[PDB]
Subunit: 394 residues, 4 copies
């Protein structure tokens, strides 16, 4: 079972969560069997996603009322991602897109602007039904994404977004973009896969996370309904309450890297147990590996707890609610990006040359684990700015 | 308030615990005021202990039935120690001796061999009353401690123990010793003839903790006060549960120290205005490690508190299950608390290097943890690799 | 020019060395142009090796008398490898096979058993002429390589033999059990054209992909009665000198990779303008580590070059005296080059994570070091503690 | 002998250097004997300094022509300091004051403004003779040090300097200060005799380590300074990268001290472990790490010292770039030492165990001594980052 800990991401807190892990169990052997291939080929395992969608799994964070599995716990979500990542991190990183979207919409449905509340409800039932599969398209690429107002009211959308995981089998896209008018207001409109002007580019050549299908999407005069635009604030002038949402949609991903470090450790320990007597060099590494794992497990589970605590709690200063969620998140992230990578490095050096063959799982794991560092929010540079800002007053 | 965290030692879990922190609040300004002197002098602040003993504090881990404050939570104990250590770590290190003893006896009282069960009950009431003050004397010094039978029956005790904190103001001593060679921990009163307390405590930090040597020279021990428990060498993993309970709480201290150092460093930097590119990183790093410490520690304590009473199931495995998290946390703390303090120190600058300055004191204080059994780094590694590799 | 240092691998010490770097200069732009493809394909750049062999480069460590370039300096060899590795580390790792073989034979020619002395001389002229291309085949794979007495027939399988793609000969380290009286070890030279010899194109490394580190299976290969060199069987510390000479230069490669990574990251940051508080630290750390690597490595090379010819004095201690600095430097490199590259990568951001991007290639390439014998970390620890603790 | 390395601070490069180590040899056993006391007392070993001064050692960096020992090599100076620091770091930290001053004045004598050149020559002879003992007073303390012009012309000096090592037994002080007037605001380092009226030496040195070094505060209260002893060099705020060369020469040698401390710590830890017999799986690794880091320190440091020694005299070429070219390797080395010497000591301490933690025990002294370097300008971590990133990023 590996490194165990109380409040350290080992068992699910909620029975929804429990149900979800049980469902995953039947998919894991397949995920694992296919992992090498999907990695070599850089190929999203569409077939397995079909089975999962049909067996209710892509509906996991969809409330029970709307036909989903009603997993509301970021802890449990993270934990589920860790299990999957144990077998294939690419795939987890993709399911995350769905799972988090569930939650982010589920908040909108209960607490968003009265007008958008039913659209949220719509998409949620669609996800529960196995019909809708939603990706966020966030990162612009050398050219900012803009939608403007066409002649008859209706808006036309134009831009290019990069690193959209799971976009392979997407049916919708929530596209964060700025809108052009005096005022410059920003928005995240829902856009169907079948929208004319939309092309999915298969240019995903990542060193790891290859099975995740993090492809680019170009929008070229895409028609967007007058009603599907959700204008929320504006660029530059940022509000700390936005940080709550920002937290909810990324935090769960940390389970992935814990998952990878766990997997690497498992492989390395069995390998060593299979050699007999243990040299003075390895005892130390193992002890260090496990100590770092424990540090990861607990640091992460704590941040998740904080986030789960304020997930619904809306009373109190909103700006402070954001900060209060984001800070533990960013601490844990800083820790994971340092330690998961070290654990994997050390598991690799403990196994030896065989681990360096690209076919070998450790090789895959070493390439996969380095992905976290890059993810916003935040990389190290921003991470420092944010966390020093919070600490020093400004 | 510093670095805060859910399940990270910030607030007490139990109302006993909450009551305890409130009591401590009135002592802290004094503790802090005296810290520099008590440190320079290497002098246990006996006067402040008197007040605490009399205000019920030294009976914190004594059940309510027996007149104590009924703090049963290692989490809350640890947290209390962290607050105190914020102001003076030596003192915490000493109070730990009392607090942990409370718990260890409290277990004996409910679960120990039927014979010793009343002796436990006695001492507990005595501590609750502010009458008894108990220290463990564990580490032998170049010569193992042995009690033999005075050819009648009654036993005479002979040996030397080192680094016994709070021994200064002790009334009793639980003395782990070997007597097949069977091993035991008899209670021994301060007033026992043949007992000398040596004031030879010259540690680089934890100076106020009075970790003095005690020599026993043919000390009379009642036929009834000997508690023979197994034998040295052949170890049982269930012993690890007890071993865990009596040390784990100490980890709060180093968290306490790191927090303190952080507080100092941060206010100092705030007071400088614009913040150079060097410091932003160090601050971010400092806090991240703090967050890691808080949560890693609070987790181990949680595990410990969970199995504290839970006696059903394999006892060997219960020990392991408590000790392992403890050792992981301890490995982390010994690395990171020291780092945090180091970094806080470099952040503040030259001034921090004056012995009088609190950082200096803190930097010397923090290095103490690494040495504590169980376990240091070498044993730590052996244990944790053993658990991991099967053998 | 990157991080510069006196006695830190920045300029060549000998004029042979200087001549060598100048030759390389014309190949670098091509090497760099081809690097992505050669990497994606996992394909040894045979065409560029032909040009280099013909332009005298593969004879760099072949003495002047025998028509080679007479580069005798490990420092300079290392430095050369760093330049090349700057552009493609796979390629460097391949050329190393040639350069080191140059030196190892050149030692044999002057100091080896009188009998083998002309064979050495032969191969050396061959390499200088651009005719011979020599790989060592060292690592057995799940089954030890053995030659027996039929003239001898050779049977086994060797793995990770770089440059074996375009090899003409193979020195094959193996143990011998000539159908008679046991048991001695030897490194016979074996021609590429020998019947029973198959080169397997199964090189699927995560990095060092262009180096062609393929497997060679020998199946009853005929070896002359005269081409067998039986050396010992129980290890001797004087072997460590040879062992050192043939690997130490490789450390240049990782220095090369770290430098490359740094260059890329820095230009990328310079191109962004204002520099956030997080990056100033990382840059300072990156460069400090680089300076550490440069100087630690150049030092070990200096020690190796000092004892390269100096044969007077205790031979066992000569080995130790070369190997120990080597192992320190290797311990440092395998830790720091990887760190510098990790940090350069995180400084550049997402784009660095695209397999096509040079950083991604550099990140996968750099990890290779740690596996290389002698020594990995486990053995590395055993050796360096053994030397330190007496036994 | 410990961790050995070619170009790693093990033997002296020059015969003046060799001569200097030999002299030191007779003082080491005494230094070591007194180290615990001098440390507990926080007391500069004045008596031993007297013997050293009289045996010529305090004029080690004074040229032969002027009756000193003519040690011109930063490598060898650093190495000497490493030997001494092996026995008492406080002391080394004080001698450094003398040795570096020798060099910095030796540069002035040959290459400073034609007017100051004989003053330099004066002080050098004085140091060589065992008569003069010169400390730098650099760090202001909550109030900047200023000298103004007394209506007559002659200047009166006013301020407070901190952490001036060896000031205990000082005869002169070079005092870096700003001179504010009329503005512009020009800066200077005038020589000031110990006996100058208005000068008080405060014995308030309570460091956690380096306790024997006598790093006391000096307050100047309207001290009379000759019209001729003021050396006005540029002005604050607007810095020039050629100043970096001087700045390097006067601090770089100190790095030998921390190497010295780490080596000492290692020696103690290893003998202690050898004395225990069989070696557990935990220690093998730590030893291996300790030694690797020592090798790293040795070589990193000796490299920077070589760079420094190379440009010490070489004045042709871009002066601004000469400074940078010296200071950068120095700062790299410093960043490594402040990290690793502390680690090596930490690890040696954990290897020895509880005994090490007794304040009387040498490790305890060493652990408190080693942490001193991080604080030394130039540069601490914060500035170090700033400088090093500046050089790397263009600006």
């Amino acid at each position: 079972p590996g490194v165990l800990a109380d409040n350290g991401l080992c068992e699910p807190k909620t029975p929804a969560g429990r149900r979800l892990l049980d469902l995953l169990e039947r998919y894991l052997p397949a995920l694992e069997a296919e992992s090498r291939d999907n990695d070599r080929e850089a190929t999203l395992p569409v077939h397995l996603f079909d089975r999962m969608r049909k067996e209710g799994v892509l509906g996991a964070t969809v409330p029970e009322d709307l036909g989903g599995l009603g997993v509301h716990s970021l802890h449990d979500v993270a934990l589920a991602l860790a299990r999957i990542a144990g077998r294939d991190a690419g795939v987890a990183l993709a399911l995350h897109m769905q799972f988090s979207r569930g939650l982010t919409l589920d908040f909108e449905w209960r607490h968003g602007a009265p007008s958008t509340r039913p659209l949220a409800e719509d998409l949620l039932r669609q996800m529960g039904a196995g019909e809708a599969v939603i990706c966020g398209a966030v990162k612009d690429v050398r050219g900012t994404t803009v939608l403007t107002r066409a002649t008859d009211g209706s808006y036309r959308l134009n831009g290019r977004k990069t690193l959209v995981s799971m976009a392979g089998i997407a049916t919708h896209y929530v596209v964060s973009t700025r809108l052009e008018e005096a005022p410059v207001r920003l928005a995240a409109p829902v856009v169907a896969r079948t929208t004319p002007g939309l092309t999915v580019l298969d240019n995903w050549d990542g060193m790891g996370m290859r099975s995740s299908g993090s492809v680019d999407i170009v929008f070229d005069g895409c028609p967007v309904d007058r009603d599907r635009v959700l204008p929320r604030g504006e660029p530059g002038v940022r509000d700390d309450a936005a940080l709550a949402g920002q937290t909810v949609s990324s935090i769960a991903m940390l389970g992935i890297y814990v998952g990878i470090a766990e997997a690497a450790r498992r492989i390395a320990l069995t390998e060593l147990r299979r050699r007999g007597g243990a040299p003075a060099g390895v005892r130390t590494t193992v002890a260090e590996i496990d100590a770092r794992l424990f540090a990861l497990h607990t640091a992460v589970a704590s941040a998740l707890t904080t986030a789960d605590r304020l997930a619904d709690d809306l009373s109190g200063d909103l700006a402070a609610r954001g900060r209060a969620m984001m800070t533990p998140f960013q601490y844990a992230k800083l820790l994971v990006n340092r330690h998961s990578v070290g654990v994997v490095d050390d598991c690799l050096m403990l196994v030896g040359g065989a681990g360096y063959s690209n076919s070998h799982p450790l090789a895959r794991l070493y390439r996969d684990v380095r992905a976290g560092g890059f993810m916003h929010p935040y990389n190290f540079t921003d991470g420092v700015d944010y966390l020093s800002e919070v600490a020093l007053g400004r």
